[PDB]
Design a protein around this nucleic acid. Structure first.
Ligand SMILES: [Zn+2]
Lengths: 98, 49
DNA sequence: TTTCTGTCTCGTGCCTGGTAATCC
RNA sequence: UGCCUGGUGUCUUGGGUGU
DNA sequence: GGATTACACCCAAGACACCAGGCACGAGACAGAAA
């Protein structure tokens, strides 16, 4: 019973989405500490999306705001610096199909 | 005191300030070198001279 | 049953090795 | 006469701040 | 194939030789045995 328990707990605790002994080459940052500075910050954090294109081999096109983003992601809210444009926030009426 | 600050200090021409920043205000050390081999292999015992 | 005790199991201990672009 | 103390991991990762 | 892709600063959080199996020292209990 320790296998599944430890695997799930490790992946959720550290954010590395994979086996513990394969930490390298695994997608990191999937799980993050909830931001509780203020209510709006928590609400924003719970509705955040990430594009795992990384920093190596960057290009401007993935970071741009496309025409098809209308109504599905926020045109104004994006971080500064490295993750600009790659991190998106759902619009206020958006949903994800189940 | 990164590399760009070092370049700014070079541009000002202040060699003494740069030497003091990188030695006295940081990791300064004393070693003994052989006058022949030129390596830091001298076994120096200061108290026994 | 009283008394001296055996000797082999066993608690405590431990050694030590297995197991992403671009550019030249 | 009962007599005073300086000594602080490392490696990853994430989120941020100023240009 | 190789090498390199701005500067500085803050904070928080999770992991870092474990282990198992064979070898030794000491002890003790419950059963032997004479009386
Ligand atoms: Zn010499």
């Amino acid at each position: 019973s320790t296998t599944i328990t430890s695997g799930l707990k490790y992946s959720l605790a550290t954010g590395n989405w994979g086996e513990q002994k394969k930490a390298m080459s695994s997608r990191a940052g999937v799980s993050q500490v909830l931001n509780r500075y203020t209510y709006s910050s928590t609400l924003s954090h719970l509705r955040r999306t990430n594009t795992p294109i990384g920093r190596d081999g960057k290009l401007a096109k993935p970071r741009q705001l496309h025409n098809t983003h209308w109504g599905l992601v926020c045109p104004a809210e994006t971080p500064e610096g490295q993750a600009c444009g790659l991190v998106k926030n759902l619009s206020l009426l958006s949903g994800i199909s189940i | 005191f990164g590399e760009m600050e070092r370049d700014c200090m070079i541009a000002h021409g202040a060699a003494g300030f740069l030497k003091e920043r990188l030695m006295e205000a940081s990791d300064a050390f004393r070693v003994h070198v052989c006058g022949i081999c030129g390596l830091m292999s001298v076994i120096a015992n200061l108290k026994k001279n």
